[PDB]
Coordinates of C-alpha atoms (C1' of nucleotides) and ligand atoms in Angstrom, one line a residue:
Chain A
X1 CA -27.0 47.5 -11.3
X2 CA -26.9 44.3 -12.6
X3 CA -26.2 41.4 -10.1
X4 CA -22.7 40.0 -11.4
X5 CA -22.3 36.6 -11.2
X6 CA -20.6 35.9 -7.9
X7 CA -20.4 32.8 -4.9
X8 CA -22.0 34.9 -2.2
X9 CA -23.6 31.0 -1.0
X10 CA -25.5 32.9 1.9
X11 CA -27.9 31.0 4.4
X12 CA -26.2 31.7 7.7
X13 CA -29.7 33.9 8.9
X14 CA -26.5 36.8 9.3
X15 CA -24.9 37.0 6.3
X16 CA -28.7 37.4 4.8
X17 CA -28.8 40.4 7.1
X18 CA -25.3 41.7 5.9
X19 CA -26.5 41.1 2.4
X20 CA -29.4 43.5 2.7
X21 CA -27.7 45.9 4.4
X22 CA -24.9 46.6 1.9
X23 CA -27.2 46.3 -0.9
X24 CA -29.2 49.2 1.0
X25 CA -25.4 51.1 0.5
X26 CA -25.4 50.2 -3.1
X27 CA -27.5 53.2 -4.8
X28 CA -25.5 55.6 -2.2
X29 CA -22.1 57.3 -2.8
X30 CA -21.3 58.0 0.6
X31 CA -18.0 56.4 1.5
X32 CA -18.2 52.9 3.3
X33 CA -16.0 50.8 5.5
X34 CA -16.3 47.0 5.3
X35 CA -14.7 45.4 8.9
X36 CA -14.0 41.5 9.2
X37 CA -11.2 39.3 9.8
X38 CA -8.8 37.4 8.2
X39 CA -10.6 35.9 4.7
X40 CA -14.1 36.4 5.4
X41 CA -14.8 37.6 2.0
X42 CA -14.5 41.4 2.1
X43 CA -13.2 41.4 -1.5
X44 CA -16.9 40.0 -2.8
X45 CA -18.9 42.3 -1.0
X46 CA -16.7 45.3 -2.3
X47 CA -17.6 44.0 -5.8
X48 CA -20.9 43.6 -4.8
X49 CA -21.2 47.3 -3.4
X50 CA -19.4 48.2 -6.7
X51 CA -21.2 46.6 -9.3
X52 CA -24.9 46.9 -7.9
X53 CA -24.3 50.6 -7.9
X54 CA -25.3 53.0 -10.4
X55 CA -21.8 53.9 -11.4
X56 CA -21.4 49.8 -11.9
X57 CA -20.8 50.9 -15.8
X58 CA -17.3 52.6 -14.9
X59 CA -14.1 51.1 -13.9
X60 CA -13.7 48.5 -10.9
X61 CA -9.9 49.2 -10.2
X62 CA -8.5 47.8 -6.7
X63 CA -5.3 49.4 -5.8
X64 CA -3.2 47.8 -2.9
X65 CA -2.1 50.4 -0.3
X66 CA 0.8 48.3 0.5
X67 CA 2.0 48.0 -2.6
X68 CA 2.5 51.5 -3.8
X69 CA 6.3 52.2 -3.8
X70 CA 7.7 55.6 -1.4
X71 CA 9.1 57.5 -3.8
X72 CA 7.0 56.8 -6.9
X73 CA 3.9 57.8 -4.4
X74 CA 3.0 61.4 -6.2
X75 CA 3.2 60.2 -9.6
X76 CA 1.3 56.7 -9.2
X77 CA -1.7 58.2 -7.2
X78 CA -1.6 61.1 -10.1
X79 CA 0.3 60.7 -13.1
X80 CA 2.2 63.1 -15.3
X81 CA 1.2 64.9 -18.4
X82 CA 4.3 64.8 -19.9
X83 CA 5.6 61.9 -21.6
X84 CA 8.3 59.3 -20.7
X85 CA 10.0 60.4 -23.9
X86 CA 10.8 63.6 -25.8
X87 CA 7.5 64.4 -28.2
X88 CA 5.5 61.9 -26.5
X89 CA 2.0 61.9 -27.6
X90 CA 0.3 60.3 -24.5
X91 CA 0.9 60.3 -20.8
X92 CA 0.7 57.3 -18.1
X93 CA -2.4 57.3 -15.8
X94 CA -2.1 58.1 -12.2
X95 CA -4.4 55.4 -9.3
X96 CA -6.6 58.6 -9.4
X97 CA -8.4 59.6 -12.5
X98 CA -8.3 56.0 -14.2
X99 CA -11.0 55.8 -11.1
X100 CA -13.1 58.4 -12.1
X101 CA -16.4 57.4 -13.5
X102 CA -16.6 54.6 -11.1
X103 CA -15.4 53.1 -7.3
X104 CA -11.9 52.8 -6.3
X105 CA -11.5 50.3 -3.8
X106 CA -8.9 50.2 -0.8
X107 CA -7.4 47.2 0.8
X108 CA -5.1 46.8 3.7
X109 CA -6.1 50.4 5.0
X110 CA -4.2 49.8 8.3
X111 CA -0.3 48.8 6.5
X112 CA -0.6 51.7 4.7
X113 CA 2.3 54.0 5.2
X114 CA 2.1 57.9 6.8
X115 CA 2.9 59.1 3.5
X116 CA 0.1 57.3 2.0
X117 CA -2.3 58.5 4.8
X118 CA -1.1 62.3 5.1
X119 CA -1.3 62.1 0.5
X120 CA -4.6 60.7 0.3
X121 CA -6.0 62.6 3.1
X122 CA -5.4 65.8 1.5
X123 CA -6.8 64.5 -2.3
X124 CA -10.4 63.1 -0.6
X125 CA -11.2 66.0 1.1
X126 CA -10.9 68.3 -2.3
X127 CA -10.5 66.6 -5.1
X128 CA -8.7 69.2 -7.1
X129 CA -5.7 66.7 -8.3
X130 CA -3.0 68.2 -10.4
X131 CA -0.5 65.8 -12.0
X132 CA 3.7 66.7 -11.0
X133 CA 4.0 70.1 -13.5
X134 CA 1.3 72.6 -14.7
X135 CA -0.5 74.5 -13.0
X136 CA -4.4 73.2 -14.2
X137 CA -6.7 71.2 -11.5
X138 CA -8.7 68.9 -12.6
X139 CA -12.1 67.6 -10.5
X140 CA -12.2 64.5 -9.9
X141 CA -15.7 62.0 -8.7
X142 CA -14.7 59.2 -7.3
X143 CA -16.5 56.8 -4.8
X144 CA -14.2 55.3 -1.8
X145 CA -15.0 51.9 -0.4
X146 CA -12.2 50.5 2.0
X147 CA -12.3 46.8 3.8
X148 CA -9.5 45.9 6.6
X149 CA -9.2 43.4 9.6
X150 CA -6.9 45.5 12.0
X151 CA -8.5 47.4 14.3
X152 CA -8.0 51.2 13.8
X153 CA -8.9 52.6 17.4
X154 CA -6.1 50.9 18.6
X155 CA -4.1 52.1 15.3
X156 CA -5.1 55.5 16.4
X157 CA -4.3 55.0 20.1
X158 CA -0.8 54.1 19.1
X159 CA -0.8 57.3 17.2
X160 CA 0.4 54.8 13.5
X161 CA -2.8 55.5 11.5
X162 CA -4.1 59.4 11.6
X163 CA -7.5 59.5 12.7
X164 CA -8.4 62.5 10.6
X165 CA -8.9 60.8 8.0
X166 CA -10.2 57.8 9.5
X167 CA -12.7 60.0 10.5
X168 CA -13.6 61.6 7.1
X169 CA -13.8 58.1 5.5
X170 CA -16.1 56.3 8.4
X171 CA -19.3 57.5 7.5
X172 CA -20.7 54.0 8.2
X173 CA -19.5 50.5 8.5
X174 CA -20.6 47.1 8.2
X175 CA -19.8 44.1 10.3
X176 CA -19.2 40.6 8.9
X177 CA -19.7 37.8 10.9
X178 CA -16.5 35.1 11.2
X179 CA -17.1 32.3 9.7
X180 CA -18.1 30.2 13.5
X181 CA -20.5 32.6 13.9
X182 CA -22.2 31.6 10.9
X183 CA -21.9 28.1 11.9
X184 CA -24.9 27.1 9.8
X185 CA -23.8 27.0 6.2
X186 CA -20.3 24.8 6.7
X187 CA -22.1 21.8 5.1
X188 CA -23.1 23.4 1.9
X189 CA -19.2 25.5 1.1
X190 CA -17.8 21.8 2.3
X191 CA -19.9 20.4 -0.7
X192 CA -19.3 23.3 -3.1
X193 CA -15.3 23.0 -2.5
X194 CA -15.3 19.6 -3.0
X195 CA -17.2 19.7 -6.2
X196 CA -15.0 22.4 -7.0
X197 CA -11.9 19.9 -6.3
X198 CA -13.4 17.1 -7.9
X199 CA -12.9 18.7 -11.6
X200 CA -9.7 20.6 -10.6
X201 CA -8.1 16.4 -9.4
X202 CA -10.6 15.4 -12.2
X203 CA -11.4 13.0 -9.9
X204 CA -14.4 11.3 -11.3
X205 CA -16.8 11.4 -8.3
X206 CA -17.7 12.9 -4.4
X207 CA -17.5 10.2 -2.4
X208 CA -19.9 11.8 0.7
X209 CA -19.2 12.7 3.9
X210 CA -18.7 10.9 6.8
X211 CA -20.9 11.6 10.1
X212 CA -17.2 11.6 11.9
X213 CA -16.4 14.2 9.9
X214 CA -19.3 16.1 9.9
X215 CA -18.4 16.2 13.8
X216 CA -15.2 16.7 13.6
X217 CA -15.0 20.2 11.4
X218 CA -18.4 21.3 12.6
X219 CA -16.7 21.1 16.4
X220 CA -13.8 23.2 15.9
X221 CA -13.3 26.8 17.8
X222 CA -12.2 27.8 13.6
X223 CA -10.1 30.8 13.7
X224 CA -9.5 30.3 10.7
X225 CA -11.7 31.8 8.1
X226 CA -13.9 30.4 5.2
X227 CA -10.6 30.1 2.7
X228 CA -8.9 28.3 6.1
X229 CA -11.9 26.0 5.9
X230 CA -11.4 25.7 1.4
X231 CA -7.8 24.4 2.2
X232 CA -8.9 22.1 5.2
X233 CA -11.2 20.1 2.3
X234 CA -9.0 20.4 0.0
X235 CA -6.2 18.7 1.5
X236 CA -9.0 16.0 2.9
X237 CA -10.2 15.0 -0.2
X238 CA -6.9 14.5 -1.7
X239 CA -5.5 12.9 0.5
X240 CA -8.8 10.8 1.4
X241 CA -8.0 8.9 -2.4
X242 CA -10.3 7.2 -5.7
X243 CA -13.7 8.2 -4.1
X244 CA -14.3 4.2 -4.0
X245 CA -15.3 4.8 -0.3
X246 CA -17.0 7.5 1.9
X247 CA -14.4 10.6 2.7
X248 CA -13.7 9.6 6.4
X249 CA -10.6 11.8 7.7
X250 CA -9.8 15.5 8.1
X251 CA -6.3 16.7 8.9
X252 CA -7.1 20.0 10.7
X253 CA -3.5 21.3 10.4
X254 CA -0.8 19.7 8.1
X255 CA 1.8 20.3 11.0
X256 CA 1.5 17.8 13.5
X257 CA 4.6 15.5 12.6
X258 CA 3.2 12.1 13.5
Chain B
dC1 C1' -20.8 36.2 -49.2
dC2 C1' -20.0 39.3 -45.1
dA3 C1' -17.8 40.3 -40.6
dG4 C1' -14.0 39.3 -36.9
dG5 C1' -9.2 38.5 -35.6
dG6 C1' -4.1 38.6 -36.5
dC7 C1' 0.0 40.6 -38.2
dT8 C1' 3.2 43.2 -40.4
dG9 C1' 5.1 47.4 -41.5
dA10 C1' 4.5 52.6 -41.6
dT11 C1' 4.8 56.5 -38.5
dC12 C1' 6.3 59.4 -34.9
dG13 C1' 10.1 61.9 -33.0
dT14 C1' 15.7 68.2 -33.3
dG15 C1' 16.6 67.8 -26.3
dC16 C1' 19.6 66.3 -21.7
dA17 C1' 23.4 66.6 -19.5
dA18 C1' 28.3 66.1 -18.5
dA19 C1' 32.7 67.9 -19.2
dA20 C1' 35.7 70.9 -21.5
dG21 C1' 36.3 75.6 -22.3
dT22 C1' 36.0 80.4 -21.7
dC23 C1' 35.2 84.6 -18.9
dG24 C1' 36.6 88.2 -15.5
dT25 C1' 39.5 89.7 -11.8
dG26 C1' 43.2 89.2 -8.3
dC27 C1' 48.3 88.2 -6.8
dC28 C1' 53.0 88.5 -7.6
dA29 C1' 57.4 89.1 -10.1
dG30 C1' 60.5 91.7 -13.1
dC31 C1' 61.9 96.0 -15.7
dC32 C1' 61.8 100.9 -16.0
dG33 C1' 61.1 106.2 -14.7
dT34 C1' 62.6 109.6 -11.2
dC35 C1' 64.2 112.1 -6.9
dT36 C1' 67.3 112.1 -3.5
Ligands
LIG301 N1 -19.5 33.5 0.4 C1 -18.4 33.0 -0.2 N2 -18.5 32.4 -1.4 C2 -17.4 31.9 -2.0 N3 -16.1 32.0 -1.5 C3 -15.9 32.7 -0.3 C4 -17.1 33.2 0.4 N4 -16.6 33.8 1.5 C5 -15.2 33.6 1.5 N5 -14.8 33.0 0.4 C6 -13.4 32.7 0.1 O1 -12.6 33.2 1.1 C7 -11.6 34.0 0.5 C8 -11.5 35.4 1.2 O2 -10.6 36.2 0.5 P1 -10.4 37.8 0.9 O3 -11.8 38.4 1.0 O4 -9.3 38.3 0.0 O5 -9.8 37.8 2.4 P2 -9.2 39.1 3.1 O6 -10.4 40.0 3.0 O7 -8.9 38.7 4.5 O8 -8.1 39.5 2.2 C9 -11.9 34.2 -1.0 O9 -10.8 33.9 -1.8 C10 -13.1 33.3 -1.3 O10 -12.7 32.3 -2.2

DNA sequence: CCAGGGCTGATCGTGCAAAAGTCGTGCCAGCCGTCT
């Protein structure tokens, strides 16, 4: 509910449109898909969709789908009652549960292994989740919000991501424009990443920008995304010096060997 | 003078499992009873 304090920096006259359409998602708990690219941002409009919500009061936890071990799948996504140790008087928290209450947001959807797609497929669809022993199941509300850059048709063409549930968790998307289709607000992240740099140096001033390099960066075909364009400044204005003239040169990659 | 943070000690806990041991039941050898 309450706008957390994030840098969203939007003026692109399409990121504006993005804006309002995920904040018109934010009251609903209806799952959501959140398609980009490389970078792009995803992770800030998935807090964004979580904490302008009205479950923003419960728990924000982010669990990485690639990251979840083979074996240890059952008892991370659930938990076990019984202790680690003989007359324990607690029990470790499965992913599940410690998500209930709130959103539990899904990254790298597409990596995720067939065990992780055939176990979570089954959990959405009923809820129901009973840790490993007993026989007591426990309902669960949870909200699923999910952001990748693959692209799942073809994931589901080559038969290496199940479109079932794909299908149960694509109730409606939303499209974020790379960052050269935006190609409107480049001067103002430039300025904020420098600024940014100038304390993290503690260099003691911005020198300004150069009309050359205004050309240069702004007439680039930028595959890479915004955090591509962060380390291109970054390694400009360091390597540009003191500030005691105007930044003048951009190295677009630090590969060429000159 | 009252409230927040740190820190130290007080408190909780009689089961798992691996290997030795024991069980029942069979196989074979050696001595004894008896008829031919
Ligand atoms: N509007 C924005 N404001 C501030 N930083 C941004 C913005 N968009 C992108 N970024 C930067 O780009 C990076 C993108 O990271 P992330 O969303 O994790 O990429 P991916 O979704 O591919 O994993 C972030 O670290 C962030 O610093």
């Amino acid at each position: 509910m309450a706008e957390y304090k994030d840098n969203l920096l939007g003026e692109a006259n399409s990121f504006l449109e993005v804006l309002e359409q995920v904040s018109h998602l934010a009251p609903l708990d209806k799952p959501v898909l959140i398609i980009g690219e490389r970078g792009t941002g995803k992770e800030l409009i998935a807090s964004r969709l979580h904490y302008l919500s009205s479950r923003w009061q419960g728990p924000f936890i982010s669990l990485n789908c690639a990251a979840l071990n083979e074996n240890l799948l059952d008892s991370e996504l659930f938990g076990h009652e019984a202790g680690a140790f003989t007359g324990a008087q607690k029990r470790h928290p499965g992913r599940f549960e410690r998500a209930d209450g709130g959103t539990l947001f899904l990254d790298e959807l597409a990596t995720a292994p067939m065990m992780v797609q055939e176990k979570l497929l089954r959990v959405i669809e009923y809820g129901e989740l009973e840790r490993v022993g007993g026989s007591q199941p426990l309902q669960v509300n949870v909200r699923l919000v999910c952001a990748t850059n693959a692209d799942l048709p073809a994931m589901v063409n080559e038969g290496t991501f199940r479109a079932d549930l794909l299908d149960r968790l694509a109730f409606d998307v939303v499209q974020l424009p790379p960052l050269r289709e935006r190609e409107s607000d480049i001067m103002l992240m430039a300025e904020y990443f420098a600024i940014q740099m100038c304390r993290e140096i503690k260099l003691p001033l911005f020198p300004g920008f150069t009309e050359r390099a205004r050309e240069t960066l702004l007439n680039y075909r930028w595959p890479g995304n915004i955090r591509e364009l962060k380390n291109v400044v970054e390694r400009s204005v360091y390597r540009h010096g003191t500030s005691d003239y105007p930044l003048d040169d951009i190295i677009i990659d630090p590969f060429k060997r000159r």
